[PDB]
Amino acid sequence: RKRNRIPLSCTICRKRKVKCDKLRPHCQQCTKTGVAHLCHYMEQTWAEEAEKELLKDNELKKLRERVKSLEKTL
Amino acid sequence: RIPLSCTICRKRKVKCDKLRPHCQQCTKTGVAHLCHYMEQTWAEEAEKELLKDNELKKLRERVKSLEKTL
DNA sequence: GCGCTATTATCGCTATTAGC
DNA sequence: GCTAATAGCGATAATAGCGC
Ligand SMILES: [Zn+2]
Ligand SMILES: [Zn+2]
Ligand SMILES: [Zn+2]
Ligand SMILES: [Zn+2]
Ligand SMILES: [Zn+2]
DSSP states (O other), X not given: OOOOOOXXXXXXXXXXXXXXXXXXXXXXXXXXXXXXXGOOOOOOTTTHHHXXXXXXXXXXXXXXXXXXXXXXXX | OOOSSOHHHHHHTOOOOOOSSSOHHHHHHTOGGGOOOOSSXXXXXXXXXXXXXXXXXXHHHHHHXXXXXX
C-alpha cells in the first residue's frame, strides 16, 4: 500500500538533510548557504492544477505586455 | 454552490482553516502561493479557464505575427 | 554524509449534507 | 427512506532533519 508522497522540502535541503524553510522560489537555507538558484521543489500531484493556472496567468500577462511592446515599437 | 475550503486542501483532503489570503495548511507546507479560494461555481470557473486557454493561443500567435513582421 | 526516530502527510473509508 | 456529493478523519507509509 505505497502512498505517492512527494517531499515538500527542496531537493537540496533533502539531499543535504538540513532544515528547509520552504520559501519560494528559493529557500532561505539555500540562500544562506550560497546555492539559492540551485533551489527548486518537486511537482506535487495536487498542485499541478493550481500551478498550471498561476503560470497561465503569468503568460497572458507577459504575452500582453509583449504585444503592447512590439506594437509600441514598429 | 461554491466550496469554502481552498482548492489545495480540497485535493489534499485535509481540513482547511479557511484563513485569507492563504490558509495555514498551504502556508505551512510552503505552497501559499498556490492557495486560492473559488469565487464562482466549478462550471463557471472551468469555462473561464477555457477562454483563457484560447486567448493565450491567440496571443502567442499574435506575438509571432508581430515580431516575425518586425 | 547519513542513521534513526519524531513528526508529517496520503488516501480509503466514514460521517454528514444535498437532493430525489 | 434512499443514493449521490462533499468534507474531512485517521492509520500508517514515509519524510524531515537533528546530531554523530
Ligand atoms: Zn530548502
Ligand atoms: Zn533563482
Ligand atoms: Zn532550497
Ligand atoms: Zn486550505
Ligand atoms: Zn490553502
